[PDB]
Amino acid sequence: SKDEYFDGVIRAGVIATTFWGIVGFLVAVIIAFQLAFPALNLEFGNGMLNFGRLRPLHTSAVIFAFGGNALIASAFYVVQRTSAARLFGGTALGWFVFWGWQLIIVTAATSYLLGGSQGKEYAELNWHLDILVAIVWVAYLIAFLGTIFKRKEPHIYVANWFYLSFIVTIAMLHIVNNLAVPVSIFGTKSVQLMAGVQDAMTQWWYGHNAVGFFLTAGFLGMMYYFVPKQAERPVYSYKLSIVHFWALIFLYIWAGPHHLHYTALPDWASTLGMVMSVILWMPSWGGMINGLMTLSGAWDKLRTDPVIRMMVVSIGFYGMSTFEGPMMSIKAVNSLSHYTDWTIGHVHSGALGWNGMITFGMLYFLTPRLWGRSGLYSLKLVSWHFWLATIGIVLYASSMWVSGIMEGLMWREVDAQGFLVNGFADTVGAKFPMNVVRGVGGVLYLTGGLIMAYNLWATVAKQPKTANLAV
Amino acid sequence: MLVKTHITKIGVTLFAVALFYGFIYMLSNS
Amino acid sequence: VLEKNATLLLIFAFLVVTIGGIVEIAPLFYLENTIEKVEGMRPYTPLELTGRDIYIREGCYVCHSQMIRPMRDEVERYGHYSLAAESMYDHPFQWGSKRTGPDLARVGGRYSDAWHVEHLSNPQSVVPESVMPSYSYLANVPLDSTWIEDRVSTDALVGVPYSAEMIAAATEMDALVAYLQVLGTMVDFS
Amino acid sequence: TTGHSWDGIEELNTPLPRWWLWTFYATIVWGVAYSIAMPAATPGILGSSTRADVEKDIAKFAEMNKAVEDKLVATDLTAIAADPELVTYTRNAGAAVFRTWCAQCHGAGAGGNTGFPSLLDGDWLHGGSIETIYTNIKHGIMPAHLTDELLEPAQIDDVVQYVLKISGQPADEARATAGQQVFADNCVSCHGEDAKGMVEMGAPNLTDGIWLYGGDANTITTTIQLGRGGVMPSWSWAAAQIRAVASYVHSLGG
Amino acid sequence: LLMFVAFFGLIIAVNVTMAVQAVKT
Ligand code: HEC
Ligand code: HEC
Ligand code: HEC
Ligand code: HEC
Ligand code: HEC
Ligand SMILES: [Cu+2]
C-alpha cells in the first residue's frame, strides 16, 4: 500500500523552515544594528553578542538552516508529487535527514558563538560538523534520487533536474572545500588542506557554487514546481528549460574567480571567471523568463493571490541579481564593488528578494496542503507579509548600493595633488546612515517573517490528523 | 500585452538617468 | 532524451558540473607562482600562529581584508599590492571579502603594540568613530600553548616548513598583537 | 503543450525567445573575444596584459604629479611650510596625507590623545625644528624606577609628588621632600633640573602646563614606576610624502 | 502589477546605465 504521500517530513521541515527563518533573520537584524551602534556588541567580555562571531551564525542559520529547511520541505513535497510516489527513504531515511539537519543547525548555533570556525565563508563549521553534514546529505540524496528511481511517470520533471543537480553538486562542493586536517576536537580545530591562492580558489569555487546550486538551482526547482501550481493552465517553454538548465549547470561552476578579481589569484583564472560569469547571464535569465512567461494571461491573478505575488516578485529580484552579478563579475566593475557594501547589496537582493520570497510563497502554498488544510488561515496576512517583505528588500538594496558606491568611490578617490581624498574613517562615517536604513529594512522584512509565523501557527492549530485523505 | 510592454518601457529612462547621474557623481568622487 | 534515464541524467550532471572545478582548481596545485613563498618568508612563529587562530576565532576576517589589489589608490593607502607568495603558508587563507574596517594585509609595523592593545581593548577609545567591537577579553585570557605543538605539526604535514626544533621551542591579546605585527612584513624586508 | 503531466503541471513546447538567444550568443562571442584579447592579444600593452596595468597607473600618476613633489623636495622643509603655493598645498595635502596616515594616532585634529602627542601645540619632546620633526617622521622614535632598589614603593610616590610641584602646586609634604631629593639624583639627568627636559633624548619637560598626558599623581606614579616606552613608527618604509608631512606638521604651530 | 513591471524596467535601465559607465569608465 503506502499509496499516500509521506507528508510527515515535509511538515516538520516546513515548520522548522519558518522557525529558522525567524532566528536567522533576527540575527541579521541584530548584527546590522551592531554595525549601526557597536554597543550592541558586549564591550567587556566576548559574551553572547559580538559581531565577528555572530556574523557567520547569521550566514549559516540563514542559508543552511532557513534556506536548507526550505529546500528539504520543498524537495520532499515537490518530488513526491511531481513523480507521484511516496518518499523513498520514508520516515526512516527522510526523518533521519530531518533530525540530522536539525542537529547540524543546533551545533552551528552553539559552536559559532563559542568561536569555533574555519574562517571559510559558508564553510565555517568545524570538521566534526562537516562529517555530520556529509552523512546527512548522503542520506538526503539517497532519499531524493531513490524517490526519482521509484517514480511512476516515464519523464522526470525539470524541477527535479534542478533539485537533483543541486543535491549532487553541493555534496561534491562540500566534501572538497572541507578537506582539512584535524588538530583538535572542534571549532576550527582543523587547518584547511589548501593555502593561499589555491585555498582562495577552492573556497570561492565552493562559495559561489553554494549560492549557485544551493541558492539558485535548488530554488529554481522550487520555482518550477510552485509557480506553475495555479488554477490557470499552460504557458511555459520546455526547450528553454533544457537549454537554461544545462547551460546554467555547466557554466556556473566556472564563476568562482569573479570573487577573486584583482587579487593574488592568477590573471588567467580571474579572466575565466569573468568570461564565464558573463555567459552565465543568459541561462540564469532563462530561468526568470521561463517562470514569468508562464504567468502570461494569468497576470490578473497577481492582484488576487498574494502567494503568486510572492513567487513573481521573487523572480523579479532573481533576474535583477542575476544581472547585477555578471556586471560585478567584470573586472573593472569589481574594481569598485569589491570589499564594499555593494557586495552585501547584491547578496540580500538575491537572498531576501529571490530565495526568501520564493521559499515564502512555496511554504504558503504547501503548508496548508501538508497540514490537511484547504488554505492558509488568513490571505490578508500573506498580502501584508508580501508588502513588508518587499519594502524591506528594496530598502536594504537601496541602502547598500548607496553605501557601496560611496565606499568604492571614497576609497579610490584621488585629489588634484594626487593624494588620497578620504580617510577610511571618513568612508566609514559616510556609511552610517546606510547601516541604519539597512537595519530598518531588514527589520521590516523580519517583521513580515513574524506575521508569517503567526499566520502559519494559526493554520497549524486547526487539525490533528491532517493526512489530507489519499494525498 | 501592450499594456505590459508599454509599462515596461515606462520608467526605464528614470533609473537610466538617475544612475548616469550617480556615475558622474562617482567619477566626481573618486 | 535521457529524460527517462535516472543514471544517465545523474552521470551527465556529475560530469557537467565537474569541468570548471577541474579546469580552475587542479592546475593551481601545479603552478609555481601561487606555490612559491616569498624568499625571505618563514612560517608563523608559535605566538603568531596562536594569534592568527585567535584572529580566526573572533571573526576579524568578517570586517578586515588581507589582500591589497593592484590599484594605485589602494597601493597608496595600504602599501604594496599583495602577492600570492605571501599567503603560501596560510591555512586557511585570510584574504577578505569585506572591508568594514581597513585592509590588514600590510600592517608590518604601521602601529605600535601599545596602540594595538588599546585599540583592541576598546576601538572607540582610540578611534571614536569606529564600528569595531571591543575585545577586552583578549587581555583576560592566557595561552597554555599545549596545542601549539600539534598545530605546527599539522601545518608541517600540510607543507609548512616548521622545524622539529620550532615545534619544540613553541595573553591572547599578546598573541593577537604578535600576529598583526607580522602581516605583510615578509615582502617588505625580503 | 506536451502530453505528460506532472501533478497539475504541463509544459508548452515553445521557442526560445529570439532576444534571449541573441543575448546568450552575444555573451559567448564576447567571451571568446575577451579571451583572445586577454591572457591565453590586446594592443597597448607590450608582452601580454596583466595586473601590469598597475605599473602604468603608477607611471602616469608619477608623470602627472612628479613635478609637484619634485619641486617641493628641493625646497627646505621650513620653506615648504611657509609658501602657500607648495607650502599651502603642503598643508592641505600634507594635511591630506596626514589624515590618511597619521590621524589614527595623533587625532584628526592632530591634537593627540593620551599616549599620543599633540602636534598642533608649541610643545615638542624631540624638538620643534624642521629637521627634528622631519627626523621624527622619517626614522621614527623612560626607565622603570619602581624596580631600582632605592626607588621602591615609597620613592616613586615621592618623586611623583615632586614632579607635580615642578608642573604646579599640590600639597603633600612627604611626597615633596623625598621626591626633590630623588629627582635631583636620577630624573634630572634626562629631564634636567627644574624639568626643562632634553629634546635629544625625547625626554619631555616636567614643567609643563595642563596637557593630555596623565598629569594626575597616580598616573605619574605609574609612568615613574613602570617607565614609558612609546613609539612613533618610521614612515621611511611606508611613505617625498614624509617631507610634505614634515612641512604640514611644522606649519601646524603658527 | 503595472508597478512591478515599472520597477523591473527601472532596474534594467539602471543596469544598462552601469554597463555604459563602466565602459566609460
Ligand atoms: C601610532 C603608531 C603613531 C603613528 C601612526 C604616528 N605617530 Fe607620530 N608619534 C606617536 C607617538 C606615541 C609619539 C611620541 C613618542 C614618544 O616620544 O614617546 C609620536 C611622536 C611624533 C612626533 C614628535 C613630536 C615631538 O614632540 O617631537 C612627530 C613629529 C610625529 N609623531 C609625527 C607623525 C606623523 C607625521 C605621522 C603620520 C605619517 C605620525 N606621527 C604617525 C605615534 C604615532
Ligand atoms: C566589524 C565591525 C569589525 C570587527 C569584527 C573587527 N574590526 Fe577591526 N576595524 C573595524 C573598523 C570599522 C576599523 C576602522 C576604525 C578603527 O581604526 O578603529 C577597524 C580597525 C582595525 C585596525 C586598524 C587598521 C588600520 O587603521 O590600519 C586593526 C589593526 C583592527 N581593526 C584589527 C582587528 C582585529 C584583530 C579584529 C578581530 C579581534 C578586528 N579588527 C575586528 C571593524 C571591525
Ligand atoms: C633617561 C632616558 C630618563 C630618565 C633617567 C628619566 N626619564 Fe622620564 N622620560 C624619559 C623619556 C624619553 C620620556 C618620554 C617617554 C615617552 O614619550 O614614551 C619620559 C617621560 C616621562 C614622563 C611622562 C611625561 C608624559 O606624561 O608625557 C614622566 C612623568 C617622567 N618621564 C618622569 C620621570 C621621573 C620622575 C624620573 C626620575 C625617577 C625620570 N622620568 C627619569 C627619559 C628619562
Ligand atoms: C541567504 C539568505 C539571507 C537572508 C534571508 C538574510 N541574509 Fe544577511 N547575509 C546573508 C549572506 C550570504 C551574508 C554574507 C555576505 C558576505 O559575506 O558578503 C549576509 C550578511 C549580512 C550582514 C553583514 C553585512 C556586512 O557588511 O558585513 C548583515 C548586517 C545582514 N546580513 C543583515 C541581514 C538582515 C537585516 C536580514 C533581514 C531579513 C538578512 N540579513 C537576511 C544572507 C541572508
Ligand atoms: C543569494 C542569491 C545570489 C544570486 C542569485 C547570485 N549571487 Fe552573487 N553573491 C551572493 C553572495 C552570498 C555573495 C557574497 C560572497 C562573499 O561573501 O564574498 C555574492 C557576491 C557576488 C559577487 C562579488 C564578489 C566580490 O567579493 O566582489 C559577484 C561578482 C557575484 N556575486 C556574481 C554573481 C553572478 C555572476 C550571479 C549569477 C549569474 C550571481 N552573483 C547571483 C549571492 C547571490
Ligand atoms: Cu560568486
PDB file of N, CA and C in Angstrom, chain A residues 310-375:
ATOM      1  N   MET A 310       4.207  36.711  -4.389  1.00  0.00           N
ATOM      2  CA  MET A 310       5.498  36.443  -3.840  1.00  0.00           C
ATOM      3  C   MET A 310       6.348  35.737  -4.855  1.00  0.00           C
ATOM      4  N   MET A 311       5.803  34.715  -5.541  1.00  0.00           N
ATOM      5  CA  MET A 311       6.609  33.976  -6.476  1.00  0.00           C
ATOM      6  C   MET A 311       7.075  34.870  -7.599  1.00  0.00           C
ATOM      7  N   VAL A 312       6.179  35.716  -8.145  1.00  0.00           N
ATOM      8  CA  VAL A 312       6.514  36.561  -9.266  1.00  0.00           C
ATOM      9  C   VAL A 312       7.581  37.552  -8.903  1.00  0.00           C
ATOM     10  N   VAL A 313       7.369  38.296  -7.809  1.00  0.00           N
ATOM     11  CA  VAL A 313       8.299  39.314  -7.404  1.00  0.00           C
ATOM     12  C   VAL A 313       9.598  38.631  -7.143  1.00  0.00           C
ATOM     13  N   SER A 314       9.523  37.389  -6.638  1.00  0.00           N
ATOM     14  CA  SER A 314      10.704  36.630  -6.365  1.00  0.00           C
ATOM     15  C   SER A 314      11.500  36.546  -7.625  1.00  0.00           C
ATOM     16  N   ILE A 315      10.848  36.198  -8.751  1.00  0.00           N
ATOM     17  CA  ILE A 315      11.622  36.107  -9.955  1.00  0.00           C
ATOM     18  C   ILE A 315      12.158  37.444 -10.364  1.00  0.00           C
ATOM     19  N   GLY A 316      11.428  38.541 -10.088  1.00  0.00           N
ATOM     20  CA  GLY A 316      11.926  39.826 -10.495  1.00  0.00           C
ATOM     21  C   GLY A 316      13.255  40.089  -9.848  1.00  0.00           C
ATOM     22  N   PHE A 317      13.374  39.827  -8.530  1.00  0.00           N
ATOM     23  CA  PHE A 317      14.606  40.061  -7.828  1.00  0.00           C
ATOM     24  C   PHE A 317      15.654  39.119  -8.333  1.00  0.00           C
ATOM     25  N   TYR A 318      15.251  37.876  -8.653  1.00  0.00           N
ATOM     26  CA  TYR A 318      16.182  36.891  -9.121  1.00  0.00           C
ATOM     27  C   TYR A 318      16.857  37.372 -10.373  1.00  0.00           C
ATOM     28  N   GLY A 319      16.080  37.883 -11.345  1.00  0.00           N
ATOM     29  CA  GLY A 319      16.641  38.337 -12.588  1.00  0.00           C
ATOM     30  C   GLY A 319      17.551  39.499 -12.330  1.00  0.00           C
ATOM     31  N   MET A 320      17.132  40.398 -11.428  1.00  0.00           N
ATOM     32  CA  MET A 320      17.889  41.589 -11.163  1.00  0.00           C
ATOM     33  C   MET A 320      19.252  41.226 -10.653  1.00  0.00           C
ATOM     34  N   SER A 321      19.326  40.267  -9.717  1.00  0.00           N
ATOM     35  CA  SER A 321      20.581  39.904  -9.114  1.00  0.00           C
ATOM     36  C   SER A 321      21.422  39.131 -10.063  1.00  0.00           C
ATOM     37  N   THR A 322      20.775  38.331 -10.913  1.00  0.00           N
ATOM     38  CA  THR A 322      21.466  37.527 -11.862  1.00  0.00           C
ATOM     39  C   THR A 322      21.996  38.374 -12.963  1.00  0.00           C
ATOM     40  N   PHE A 323      21.477  39.612 -13.089  1.00  0.00           N
ATOM     41  CA  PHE A 323      22.055  40.592 -13.962  1.00  0.00           C
ATOM     42  C   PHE A 323      23.185  41.322 -13.291  1.00  0.00           C
ATOM     43  N   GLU A 324      22.967  41.739 -12.023  1.00  0.00           N
ATOM     44  CA  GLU A 324      23.938  42.535 -11.332  1.00  0.00           C
ATOM     45  C   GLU A 324      25.174  41.729 -11.102  1.00  0.00           C
ATOM     46  N   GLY A 325      25.012  40.413 -10.882  1.00  0.00           N
ATOM     47  CA  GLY A 325      26.144  39.573 -10.626  1.00  0.00           C
ATOM     48  C   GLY A 325      27.097  39.565 -11.786  1.00  0.00           C
ATOM     49  N   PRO A 326      26.656  39.337 -13.004  1.00  0.00           N
ATOM     50  CA  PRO A 326      27.545  39.297 -14.132  1.00  0.00           C
ATOM     51  C   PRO A 326      28.230  40.613 -14.315  1.00  0.00           C
ATOM     52  N   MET A 327      27.534  41.729 -14.026  1.00  0.00           N
ATOM     53  CA  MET A 327      28.154  43.009 -14.195  1.00  0.00           C
ATOM     54  C   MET A 327      29.275  43.172 -13.220  1.00  0.00           C
ATOM     55  N   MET A 328      29.042  42.789 -11.952  1.00  0.00           N
ATOM     56  CA  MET A 328      30.040  42.950 -10.937  1.00  0.00           C
ATOM     57  C   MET A 328      31.176  42.012 -11.196  1.00  0.00           C
ATOM     58  N   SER A 329      30.915  40.948 -11.975  1.00  0.00           N
ATOM     59  CA  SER A 329      31.909  39.982 -12.349  1.00  0.00           C
ATOM     60  C   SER A 329      32.879  40.562 -13.345  1.00  0.00           C
ATOM     61  N   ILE A 330      32.582  41.748 -13.925  1.00  0.00           N
ATOM     62  CA  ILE A 330      33.539  42.340 -14.820  1.00  0.00           C
ATOM     63  C   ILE A 330      34.588  42.978 -13.973  1.00  0.00           C
ATOM     64  N   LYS A 331      35.865  42.781 -14.355  1.00  0.00           N
ATOM     65  CA  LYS A 331      36.954  43.197 -13.522  1.00  0.00           C
ATOM     66  C   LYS A 331      36.867  44.659 -13.215  1.00  0.00           C
ATOM     67  N   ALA A 332      36.535  45.510 -14.203  1.00  0.00           N
ATOM     68  CA  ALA A 332      36.518  46.927 -13.956  1.00  0.00           C
ATOM     69  C   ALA A 332      35.502  47.250 -12.907  1.00  0.00           C
ATOM     70  N   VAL A 333      34.301  46.647 -12.995  1.00  0.00           N
ATOM     71  CA  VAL A 333      33.265  46.921 -12.037  1.00  0.00           C
ATOM     72  C   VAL A 333      33.657  46.422 -10.679  1.00  0.00           C
ATOM     73  N   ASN A 334      34.205  45.194 -10.611  1.00  0.00           N
ATOM     74  CA  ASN A 334      34.585  44.567  -9.375  1.00  0.00           C
ATOM     75  C   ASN A 334      35.613  45.441  -8.738  1.00  0.00           C
ATOM     76  N   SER A 335      36.386  46.170  -9.562  1.00  0.00           N
ATOM     77  CA  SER A 335      37.414  47.015  -9.046  1.00  0.00           C
ATOM     78  C   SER A 335      36.792  47.956  -8.050  1.00  0.00           C
ATOM     79  N   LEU A 336      35.600  48.515  -8.356  1.00  0.00           N
ATOM     80  CA  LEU A 336      34.882  49.358  -7.424  1.00  0.00           C
ATOM     81  C   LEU A 336      34.157  48.588  -6.354  1.00  0.00           C
ATOM     82  N   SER A 337      33.397  47.557  -6.777  1.00  0.00           N
ATOM     83  CA  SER A 337      32.443  46.866  -5.945  1.00  0.00           C
ATOM     84  C   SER A 337      33.061  46.092  -4.822  1.00  0.00           C
ATOM     85  N   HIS A 338      34.215  45.465  -5.068  1.00  0.00           N
ATOM     86  CA  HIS A 338      34.804  44.546  -4.138  1.00  0.00           C
ATOM     87  C   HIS A 338      35.089  45.231  -2.825  1.00  0.00           C
ATOM     88  N   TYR A 339      34.813  44.499  -1.723  1.00  0.00           N
ATOM     89  CA  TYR A 339      35.009  44.844  -0.330  1.00  0.00           C
ATOM     90  C   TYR A 339      34.075  45.920   0.129  1.00  0.00           C
ATOM     91  N   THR A 340      33.109  46.332  -0.715  1.00  0.00           N
ATOM     92  CA  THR A 340      32.207  47.369  -0.295  1.00  0.00           C
ATOM     93  C   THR A 340      30.891  46.747   0.056  1.00  0.00           C
ATOM     94  N   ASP A 341      29.965  47.565   0.590  1.00  0.00           N
ATOM     95  CA  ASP A 341      28.655  47.122   0.992  1.00  0.00           C
ATOM     96  C   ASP A 341      27.883  46.681  -0.213  1.00  0.00           C
ATOM     97  N   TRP A 342      28.330  47.061  -1.427  1.00  0.00           N
ATOM     98  CA  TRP A 342      27.628  46.682  -2.624  1.00  0.00           C
ATOM     99  C   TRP A 342      27.526  45.180  -2.677  1.00  0.00           C
ATOM    100  N   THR A 343      28.592  44.456  -2.295  1.00  0.00           N
ATOM    101  CA  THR A 343      28.554  43.016  -2.361  1.00  0.00           C
ATOM    102  C   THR A 343      27.407  42.536  -1.525  1.00  0.00           C
ATOM    103  N   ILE A 344      27.243  43.157  -0.360  1.00  0.00           N
ATOM    104  CA  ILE A 344      26.146  42.832   0.541  1.00  0.00           C
ATOM    105  C   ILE A 344      24.808  43.155  -0.126  1.00  0.00           C
ATOM    106  N   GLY A 345      24.752  44.284  -0.832  1.00  0.00           N
ATOM    107  CA  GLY A 345      23.545  44.696  -1.532  1.00  0.00           C
ATOM    108  C   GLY A 345      23.133  43.582  -2.472  1.00  0.00           C
ATOM    109  N   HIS A 346      24.076  43.184  -3.320  1.00  0.00           N
ATOM    110  CA  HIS A 346      23.905  42.078  -4.248  1.00  0.00           C
ATOM    111  C   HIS A 346      23.432  40.881  -3.444  1.00  0.00           C
ATOM    112  N   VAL A 347      24.043  40.535  -2.274  1.00  0.00           N
ATOM    113  CA  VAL A 347      23.705  39.308  -1.614  1.00  0.00           C
ATOM    114  C   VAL A 347      22.284  39.308  -1.152  1.00  0.00           C
ATOM    115  N   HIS A 348      21.837  40.374  -0.477  1.00  0.00           N
ATOM    116  CA  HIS A 348      20.499  40.410   0.036  1.00  0.00           C
ATOM    117  C   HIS A 348      19.477  40.627  -1.033  1.00  0.00           C
ATOM    118  N   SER A 349      19.846  41.258  -2.163  1.00  0.00           N
ATOM    119  CA  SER A 349      18.871  41.371  -3.209  1.00  0.00           C
ATOM    120  C   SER A 349      18.492  39.960  -3.561  1.00  0.00           C
ATOM    121  N   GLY A 350      19.488  39.095  -3.828  1.00  0.00           N
ATOM    122  CA  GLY A 350      19.213  37.723  -4.144  1.00  0.00           C
ATOM    123  C   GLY A 350      18.622  36.988  -2.960  1.00  0.00           C
ATOM    124  N   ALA A 351      19.141  37.232  -1.739  1.00  0.00           N
ATOM    125  CA  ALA A 351      18.714  36.495  -0.576  1.00  0.00           C
ATOM    126  C   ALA A 351      17.305  36.773  -0.152  1.00  0.00           C
ATOM    127  N   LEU A 352      16.970  38.054   0.082  1.00  0.00           N
ATOM    128  CA  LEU A 352      15.639  38.404   0.504  1.00  0.00           C
ATOM    129  C   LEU A 352      14.705  38.339  -0.662  1.00  0.00           C
ATOM    130  N   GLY A 353      15.113  38.967  -1.782  1.00  0.00           N
ATOM    131  CA  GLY A 353      14.266  39.106  -2.936  1.00  0.00           C
ATOM    132  C   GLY A 353      13.995  37.820  -3.659  1.00  0.00           C
ATOM    133  N   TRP A 354      15.036  37.021  -3.964  1.00  0.00           N
ATOM    134  CA  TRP A 354      14.797  35.772  -4.635  1.00  0.00           C
ATOM    135  C   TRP A 354      14.510  34.597  -3.746  1.00  0.00           C
ATOM    136  N   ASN A 355      15.524  34.186  -2.951  1.00  0.00           N
ATOM    137  CA  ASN A 355      15.472  32.975  -2.175  1.00  0.00           C
ATOM    138  C   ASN A 355      14.365  33.042  -1.168  1.00  0.00           C
ATOM    139  N   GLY A 356      14.360  34.097  -0.342  1.00  0.00           N
ATOM    140  CA  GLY A 356      13.389  34.173   0.707  1.00  0.00           C
ATOM    141  C   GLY A 356      12.009  34.257   0.141  1.00  0.00           C
ATOM    142  N   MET A 357      11.806  35.100  -0.883  1.00  0.00           N
ATOM    143  CA  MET A 357      10.481  35.285  -1.395  1.00  0.00           C
ATOM    144  C   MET A 357       9.961  34.012  -2.011  1.00  0.00           C
ATOM    145  N   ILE A 358      10.768  33.293  -2.825  1.00  0.00           N
ATOM    146  CA  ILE A 358      10.197  32.125  -3.441  1.00  0.00           C
ATOM    147  C   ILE A 358       9.887  31.088  -2.400  1.00  0.00           C
ATOM    148  N   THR A 359      10.761  30.921  -1.387  1.00  0.00           N
ATOM    149  CA  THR A 359      10.554  29.909  -0.380  1.00  0.00           C
ATOM    150  C   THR A 359       9.320  30.230   0.409  1.00  0.00           C
ATOM    151  N   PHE A 360       9.108  31.526   0.678  1.00  0.00           N
ATOM    152  CA  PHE A 360       7.964  32.041   1.373  1.00  0.00           C
ATOM    153  C   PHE A 360       6.731  31.582   0.647  1.00  0.00           C
ATOM    154  N   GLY A 361       6.645  31.892  -0.661  1.00  0.00           N
ATOM    155  CA  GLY A 361       5.480  31.590  -1.450  1.00  0.00           C
ATOM    156  C   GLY A 361       5.254  30.112  -1.459  1.00  0.00           C
ATOM    157  N   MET A 362       6.348  29.348  -1.584  1.00  0.00           N
ATOM    158  CA  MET A 362       6.359  27.916  -1.638  1.00  0.00           C
ATOM    159  C   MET A 362       5.681  27.393  -0.402  1.00  0.00           C
ATOM    160  N   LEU A 363       6.092  27.906   0.773  1.00  0.00           N
ATOM    161  CA  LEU A 363       5.559  27.471   2.040  1.00  0.00           C
ATOM    162  C   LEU A 363       4.110  27.828   2.159  1.00  0.00           C
ATOM    163  N   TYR A 364       3.740  29.065   1.790  1.00  0.00           N
ATOM    164  CA  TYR A 364       2.368  29.470   1.916  1.00  0.00           C
ATOM    165  C   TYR A 364       1.527  28.534   1.115  1.00  0.00           C
ATOM    166  N   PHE A 365       2.024  28.085  -0.051  1.00  0.00           N
ATOM    167  CA  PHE A 365       1.272  27.147  -0.835  1.00  0.00           C
ATOM    168  C   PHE A 365       1.158  25.798  -0.168  1.00  0.00           C
ATOM    169  N   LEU A 366       2.305  25.188   0.195  1.00  0.00           N
ATOM    170  CA  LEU A 366       2.375  23.824   0.663  1.00  0.00           C
ATOM    171  C   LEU A 366       1.873  23.573   2.055  1.00  0.00           C
ATOM    172  N   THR A 367       2.143  24.488   3.004  1.00  0.00           N
ATOM    173  CA  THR A 367       1.864  24.203   4.380  1.00  0.00           C
ATOM    174  C   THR A 367       0.417  23.879   4.600  1.00  0.00           C
ATOM    175  N   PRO A 368      -0.563  24.520   4.014  1.00  0.00           N
ATOM    176  CA  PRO A 368      -1.920  24.132   4.253  1.00  0.00           C
ATOM    177  C   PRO A 368      -2.142  22.729   3.784  1.00  0.00           C
ATOM    178  N   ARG A 369      -1.634  22.402   2.581  1.00  0.00           N
ATOM    179  CA  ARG A 369      -1.856  21.112   1.999  1.00  0.00           C
ATOM    180  C   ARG A 369      -1.262  20.044   2.860  1.00  0.00           C
ATOM    181  N   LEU A 370      -0.023  20.251   3.340  1.00  0.00           N
ATOM    182  CA  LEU A 370       0.639  19.254   4.137  1.00  0.00           C
ATOM    183  C   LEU A 370      -0.092  19.064   5.425  1.00  0.00           C
ATOM    184  N   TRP A 371      -0.639  20.166   5.960  1.00  0.00           N
ATOM    185  CA  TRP A 371      -1.395  20.264   7.175  1.00  0.00           C
ATOM    186  C   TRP A 371      -2.798  19.765   7.027  1.00  0.00           C
ATOM    187  N   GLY A 372      -3.205  19.293   5.834  1.00  0.00           N
ATOM    188  CA  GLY A 372      -4.552  18.814   5.711  1.00  0.00           C
ATOM    189  C   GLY A 372      -5.459  19.998   5.838  1.00  0.00           C
ATOM    190  N   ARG A 373      -5.136  21.090   5.113  1.00  0.00           N
ATOM    191  CA  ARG A 373      -5.927  22.290   5.173  1.00  0.00           C
ATOM    192  C   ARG A 373      -6.093  22.788   3.771  1.00  0.00           C
ATOM    193  N   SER A 374      -7.262  23.390   3.488  1.00  0.00           N
ATOM    194  CA  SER A 374      -7.570  23.925   2.193  1.00  0.00           C
ATOM    195  C   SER A 374      -6.692  25.104   1.897  1.00  0.00           C
ATOM    196  N   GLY A 375      -6.393  25.951   2.906  1.00  0.00           N
ATOM    197  CA  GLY A 375      -5.588  27.110   2.625  1.00  0.00           C
ATOM    198  C   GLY A 375      -5.073  27.676   3.915  1.00  0.00           C
TER     199      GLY A 375
END
